[PDB]
Amino acid sequence: MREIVHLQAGQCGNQIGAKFWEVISDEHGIDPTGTYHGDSDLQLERINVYYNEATGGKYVPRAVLVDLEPGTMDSVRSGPFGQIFRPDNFVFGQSGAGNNWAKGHYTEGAELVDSVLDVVRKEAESCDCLQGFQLTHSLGGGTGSGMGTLLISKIREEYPDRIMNTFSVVPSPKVSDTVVEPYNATLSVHQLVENTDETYCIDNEALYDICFRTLKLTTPTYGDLNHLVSATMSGVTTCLRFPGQLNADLRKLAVNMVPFPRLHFFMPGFAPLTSRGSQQYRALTVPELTQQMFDAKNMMAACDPRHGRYLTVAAVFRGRMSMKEVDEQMLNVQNKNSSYFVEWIPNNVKTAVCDIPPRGLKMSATFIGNSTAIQELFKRISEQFTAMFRRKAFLHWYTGEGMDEMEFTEAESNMNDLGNPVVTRGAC
Amino acid sequence: MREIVHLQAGQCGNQIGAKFWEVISDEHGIDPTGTYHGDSDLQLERINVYYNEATGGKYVPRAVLVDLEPGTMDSVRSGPFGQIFRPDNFVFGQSGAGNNWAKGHYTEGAELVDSVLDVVRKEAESCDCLQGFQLTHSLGGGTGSGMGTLLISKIREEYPDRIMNTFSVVPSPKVSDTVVEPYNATLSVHQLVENTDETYCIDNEALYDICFRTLKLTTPTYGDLNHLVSATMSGVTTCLRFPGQLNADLRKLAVNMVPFPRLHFFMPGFAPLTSRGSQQYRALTVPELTQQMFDAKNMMAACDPRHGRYLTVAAVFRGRMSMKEVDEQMLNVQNKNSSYFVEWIPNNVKTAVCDIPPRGLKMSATFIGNSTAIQELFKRISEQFTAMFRRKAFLHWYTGEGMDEMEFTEAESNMNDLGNPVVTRGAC
Amino acid sequence: QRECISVHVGQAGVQIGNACWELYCLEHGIQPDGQMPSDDSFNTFFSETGAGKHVPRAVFVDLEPTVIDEVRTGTYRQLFHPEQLITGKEDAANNYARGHYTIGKELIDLVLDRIRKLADQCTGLQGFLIFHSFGGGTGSGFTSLLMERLSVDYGKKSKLEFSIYPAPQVSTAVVEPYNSILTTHTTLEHSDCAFMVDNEAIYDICRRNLDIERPTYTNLNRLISQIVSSITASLRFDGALNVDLTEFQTNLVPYPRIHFPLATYAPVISAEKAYHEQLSVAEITNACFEPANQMVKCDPRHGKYMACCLLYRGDVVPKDVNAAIAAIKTKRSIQFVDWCPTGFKVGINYQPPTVVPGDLAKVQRAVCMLSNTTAIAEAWARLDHKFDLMYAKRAFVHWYVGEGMEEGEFSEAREDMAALEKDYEEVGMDSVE
Amino acid sequence: QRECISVHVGQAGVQIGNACWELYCLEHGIQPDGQMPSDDSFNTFFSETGAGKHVPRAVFVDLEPTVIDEVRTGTYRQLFHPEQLITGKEDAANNYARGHYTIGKELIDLVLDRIRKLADQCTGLQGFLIFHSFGGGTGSGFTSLLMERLSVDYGKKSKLEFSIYPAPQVSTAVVEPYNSILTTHTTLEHSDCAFMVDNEAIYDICRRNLDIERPTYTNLNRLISQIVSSITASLRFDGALNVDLTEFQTNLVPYPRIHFPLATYAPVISAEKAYHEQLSVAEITNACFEPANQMVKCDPRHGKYMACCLLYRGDVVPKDVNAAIAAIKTKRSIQFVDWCPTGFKVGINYQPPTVVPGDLAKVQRAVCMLSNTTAIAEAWARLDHKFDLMYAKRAFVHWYVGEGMEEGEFSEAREDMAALEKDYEEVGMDSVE
Amino acid sequence: DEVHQNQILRELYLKELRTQILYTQYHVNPLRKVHTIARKPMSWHDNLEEPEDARFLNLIHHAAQGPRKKYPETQTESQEIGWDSEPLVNPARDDRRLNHFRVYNDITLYKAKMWS
């Protein structure tokens, strides 16, 4: 048996994991109170992967809920699926992170990381086999960036051979909600690069483009914009939750998707996504699924692959179908679009087919990409950082909390070092 | 069949003895009035270990409740289980306590304690084979120390083949309700060391810490604070009242559990302690019991176990339950906690399993521990005693009762002389 | 008496093995469970426990669960001994170094113990049918690790492999070429005969001859099950020519190195298509030597046949087959090597193949064609080319070197591949002395 | 007619008797009350008393109550003689001094009188089956005092310990390598044979074969009961080869000093596994010699067998026995001593092993392989390594000194067991003269 | 400050004590992970015959019940193989007119017991 322990930091990642839990409890057929009202026994075959068993069939998420401000945990407790977690796993903090990475790494957050290590440890040993840890945080802004960068730093020294899934919302093109998001982002990527094995960058304006241009929704909110992300980490860990055909777990993916140890920044996507009005005119088959998943309007990151080259492509299909179409159109996209795929890594598409599909469909496809188009996203925050850092602004508190300019300089130098590799891969 | 004669010295000793009789009369099925109303006949097959059988089918406790102030006996007889005790053993006394050791060990404590001996020898002799005594008392304050130490010294000489379980409330570092308490503690340790065979020190701070950090109570009262202790008491003496496999008595625990004639100071633990909120969230099994058993929150003497090697560890389980989860998981505890166990004593963990658990539970486990971390009680009384006596204040009372200055100095010398072997066993 | 042990490593191993045992149960008469409903023939595959239960000589092994949990949940959970089915607790994650070096020791001793128990229970251990793939880590690395142990223990026994060759145009993984080159580097010296079954030619033959548009892997695998059932059929049945397992081995290889035959099946037709031609022995022979039905996607016209074993099953007149071989030898489109004129080896088995409820047709004759050809040299050369191309600047190498494998083993595999490709043309060139 | 007296000493001995007598009553026809519904059979273990009852030839004795009062309370109460069950007053508390020297004297008189009274109605007495542990005070000191008194009083009679060996890795007691080291100093000269069983071997056997992930001491004692059931079976029923306790005592023990053999049970299969093996005599014999079903955690490959007896009970064809023995004698993994070529015993009995409602299955063939090996040198060194460190600075010794025992006998306990290790290394060497 | 730490914990306990919802007495047991103890053979602790669970009795029989007479569909692509495992129209295959199975004659009866 295999399992993943769910680390849930910040406020962003707090609600990310919150909406993740209703999605996979509805997939497994779980009542809000923790009762199994199921229909198929394949939900209970492999349920010891996110839901630890208790007496009476009391299933509990194996998640830990960390936030330096104690209001978002009150919100998720008061939420619909809130009376389901371990209350000891609700790690609280009586201070203010205040959207500061300095206060998320070198302060009361580092006073709380010992308790967070205690509870994540106690979640770890009460099993036998650890595939790894899946954390949700915000790459821009405080808390979750600071919590993520300190917490993965401790966990990698603790358990050094397991999988890290860092689900991060990168800072944003059109808008941004914290003035120091470039400051948090650059030196958050600085810890993220030598620590984590699999990193999902999700762009907010990409999510808004999906809910408006493709979904044609009238008033989406953080609920359904959060749910779209919830589906695309529910998809990746599915061959390990349901009986699968050419099944693929997270390491099976990571080994064949990252070519080099540092280019582990990905491009998620879930795409049987249809506008409401056009759902009735849809013709759901594997070819139109393939067209929509390789069409870059349902991409979870606002990084156009037409502006670069794909390195590796993964497709975690789910459902009841034949599969010459699966492989002949993974051939056909390679044949039709040839310049966008690197020639030093040909036949570069992993495919998996879980057989149990999500509720509401009977095929889904979690599309995962590793391309050179992550580089526009990395650069734009690098120049935003240099523009904010040349005049030495928004920085006095960051120095006063216990940092120096040398660390900021090394962070900018490390993303300038990330300016090298996947650029050289762009031109071979 | 065996017996236990159960002594209560002081206000604290009377109260925790009353809670003892409450919990084991719940376990043995006897009402307030003495009449048996039980469900299983295994509950009276060895009823005559703590209960003298009396005519009329009602059974009375075999105990004496001795205090030098005539109010706590009235409080106990006005308590819920008030009409259960023999009024011949309600040893009162009209004098002034003055939370003193000299006024209980060189003064009218002497005139009361021979009446105590007179009234305790009756049920200490009306027996087939008694195994020993349980004195419940407290070092801090008077009566329970002053009467207690002299009573121990008399009864150990007069019955020299009996196990002496003295459960003693040792001071807290954050509070004490007695200023002359370092004098009482160091003058009680001197009497306790070459006398008792099994003294169990419980520290009120670590008793409070379970009520919040583990039990998650709201308004902790001294009833619950004593109730945890009485649960440990029933856990320590359970093989002789209820049958099972690997039955452990006081002698078998002692010969296993005290290595040297001086090293008999003990630290207990009771650890199926669940919060009212988190009880449904538990998955109650034996490996989950053992982590809470060896965790540094359910140990009731305020000592971090990481400050010293365990000399010996005993585990007495209750409930019908297979022993792979005992034996293998005891090995897992000893294997990962390798430096916290001594190298000169291999396989230093005992085992007992009784078939019937405490009522309202399904599995129980009482922890018994002898380590080198007794320093964090004894040196942590010693610095107060030496700064408490170098000034030679709070002392004219004691030397006016019949005390003199010198035997204070030998009392301190012996009490810090105890530290030296339980230093040397830490570093072999 | 005459029996062979079927061991299936990898998810592909488990699924083709499920197809194999599903076909064998209905071929013999065995129910979904071990029981026999109300003579010797079971002995080749199935042992006989009392009161009619029959236990397969099957060792289903995977480093990862859920593919055996598949079996232990489905309708063949009573058929197998539950301890013959061997599971790990950690997937090989598409890595030869994990399949051979890090996660191999938690399972290799138990697998060899189970193989030893079956070999003791077996009277005449003719050989092993291993079922794996040249693709993923579970199918590659653990089969590789199995080979040296099983050859050290039972070096006098026979070895037939059934491997899924990496596809010519599609593939599924990015490290299928790495795992393929490594597993053939290690299994080249120890494998005895290894029937390559490339994946895409299955799709092409199922699209053309079967006329079916929704086959999944079960439908693609039942063809391979029919191939292996035809292969080890005369070991079990009465016939005219009794072909034996050592007889396949001594015929399909020219050299101690060239042990990669290409098979195909005749009558691959689909019931509402067989009402409209002969299925007569001449066409039965010719459809095998048509470059449209071979099970490995390489065209034999840019190659030379070395030796061909034909296994006919059913109402096969023993002299019309000689007529068909005489007809096909004179054709200029089919060309042989100049050092082997006698090339067609006849095996005749008397009873027709048994039809599974599905797509294949119940046909009164069927030959499986077993050719050793030089057309596989281009597939081996392209796998070599792909390995050079993706090994040019150490792509996907850090995982393998961190998982216990040493860097120079890649170069050793490359050099032995260059040696194998050289040996192909050195034996394919015409003699002039 | 052919009877031996069973003594059960200490809690471990009482509980393994608790399993063995309920197994024996289902072997024969005795109900819980003691009455058999309705030839000779029962006489060896069950004495007929006029009314229809079959009272045991047993003395359950323990210094402590609370374990034999449950025999005096439970379902099988009407079966035991109400004075065969003996209890003292208090626990001997893991102390050899409280087992032997001071509280042993009020119980040794009564228990030896009860042995005399049971042996009064005994015509042909082969000997004594004494069931105890190397752990607690009752199991060690009282056993030592009993065998000293039995050597004084019945000095020519055979004695077989079925000892509970201390767990080498894990343990349940802390002063076991004191109590064991003394009881094996004292019962060494007085015990004719000591069949030796630890706990963790049954733990692993039930984990890997019976598929029970938390078995308990009831499950341990049931398999120990099956071992003693198979060992005392030829003096119960009729078979091809009849072998008894005197013959076991003569031939499993090569030297006066080396009388410590080990068991191994055959099939321990678990109901939903016995439909999938043949349960042939050959594989049943091999499963005994595999170093994973061994009854004690010592490695037989780390040693050499001296003599073994194989007790085939059930439908055993009388020459599969030596077909299997000829198979074993040729393997180069089971190394024997060069000074004992003929070292095997065959004992064949027609009575199939019975089964109580529990974990084992209805098996029609079984063998309790009993071997005397040199691999117990590792176990004795491993137990002595616990003793040297603890005696190095006088740990735990104050109870022993103050409870009547003299301090200095630990010294010749160490000297005597060093002599036992020297005897093992002198008997294990290959002959060169 | 303990006086404030106890206050914030007290606020927390008031939170779950006013909003905690009990598990509403269903005891949904998984059908694939159950492992038990064995009772002592003569004892008054045990052999008192507690009654069973008839739902568990027919529910284990429902779990060990086959995928076909289980799920009335073909739930996975793995339940496609072996689903229609009954044979086709009657083989009638004991007729050796067109059936060529081996048969063990006395030479092979003697031969199967060789060597081993």
Ligand SMILES: Nc1nc2c(ncn2[C@@H]2O[C@H](COP(=O)(O)OP(=O)(O)OP(=O)(O)O)[C@@H](O)[C@H]2O)c(=O)[nH]1
């Ligand atoms: N007939 C058939 N072929 C399969 C099936 N599954 C996979 N294959 C083929 O096998 C190739 C890789 O499968 P494997 O080598 O078995 O993968 P694996 O051994 O499980 O290795 P991992 O990725 O590490 O788990 C794919 O490219 C497929 O062409 C199947 O279910 N049936």
Ligand SMILES: Nc1nc2c(ncn2[C@@H]2O[C@H](COP(=O)(O)OP(=O)(O)OP(=O)(O)O)[C@@H](O)[C@H]2O)c(=O)[nH]1
């Ligand atoms: N089969 C079986 N073995 C047991 C049982 N109880 C104890 N043992 C074995 O005995 C060892 C310790 O128990 P004993 O040596 O019998 O203890 P004792 O003889 O009763 O001596 P005291 O503890 O002083 O009462 C354990 O390590 C077990 O290996 C039992 O109930 N059944």
Ligand SMILES: Nc1nc2c(ncn2[C@@H]2O[C@H](COP(=O)(O)OP(=O)(O)O)[C@@H](O)[C@H]2O)c(=O)[nH]1
């Ligand atoms: N997908 C999703 N994103 C959210 C949700 N709530 C907030 N976000 C994003 O989280 C970002 C802010 O996170 P941040 O301030 O860094 O969290 P903090 O550091 O803990 O304060 C905003 O830009 C939102 O777009 C949600 O419920 N679902």
Ligand SMILES: Nc1nc2c(ncn2[C@@H]2O[C@H](COP(=O)(O)OP(=O)(O)O)[C@@H](O)[C@H]2O)c(=O)[nH]1
């Ligand atoms: N556990 C527990 N401790 C108590 C109880 N009553 C008093 N104590 C402890 O007893 C200590 C002082 O008691 P003490 O001075 O000896 O009372 P005295 O015997 O009348 O002199 C205090 O620190 C209390 O913590 C009780 O009911 N339960």
